[PDB]
Write a protein that binds this ligand. Structure first.
Ligand SMILES: CN(Cc1cnc2nc(N)nc(N)c2n1)c1ccc(C(=O)N[C@@H](CCC(=O)O)C(=O)O)cc1
Ligand SMILES: [Ca+2]
Ligand SMILES: [K+]
Length: 161
């Protein structure tokens, strides 16, 4: 049973994106992202791959795009079907956005790695609205802002009932 997992950073009001990059500086979230995606296939949309600016080391990078990719260092998938097939027989595949990709994988996903950030950023792209009754929280860890992280943040792992 392949576990499909969504991993996302959510500001206030479920905001995940806006026109430009999110206005926060959270190296601790990037370290949590890295820890939870290493040695796993990682599925992302082409815009998210451009946001990163490079391949993610130590993991299988699967970028979904309708147009042919122009970077041989990652795996290019024309559809979510091709993306999942590229993940092979991995026990957990990580879906890291963006907004459209989250909507397409939500029904297939049985686990979520959510970072809740205490920032009212006023964005207009939101994480999909999921039913809270169908998910249960199995991990929770809170951190305050500090000299290195611009906002307080709460790591959470949810699993489908
Ligand atoms: C813009 N972007 C998308 C991004 C950012 N934060 C997230 N945070 C969470 N929780 N989930 C996501 N899907 C997510 N996606 C990025 C940008 C940089 C790196 C990155 O380089 N991360 C390094 C670690 C950070 C570093 O090396 O400086 C890695 O090895 O994964 C990842 C995602
Ligand atoms: Ca954006
Ligand atoms: K290659």
């Amino acid at each position: 049973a392949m576990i499909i997992s969504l991993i996302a950073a959510l500001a206030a009001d479920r905001v995940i994106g806006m026109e430009n990059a999110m206005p926060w500086h959270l190296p601790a979230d990037l370290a949590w992202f890295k820890r939870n995606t290493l040695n796993k296939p990682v599925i992302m949309g082409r815009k998210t791959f451009e946001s990163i600016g490079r391949p993610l080391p130590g993991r299988l990078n699967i970028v979904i795009s309708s147009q042919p990719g122009t970077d041989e260092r990652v795996t290019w998938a024309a559809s979510i079907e091709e993306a999942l097939a590229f993940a092979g027989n991995a026990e957990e595949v990580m879906v890291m956005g963006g907004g459209r990709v989250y909507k397409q994988f939500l029904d297939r996903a049985n686990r979520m790695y959510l970072t809740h950030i205490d920032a009212e950023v006023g964005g207009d792209t939101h994480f999909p609205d999921y039913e809270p009754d169908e998910w249960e929280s199995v991990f929770s860890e809170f951190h305050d802002a500090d000299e290195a992280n611009s906002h307080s943040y709460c790591f959470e792992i949810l699993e489908r009932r």
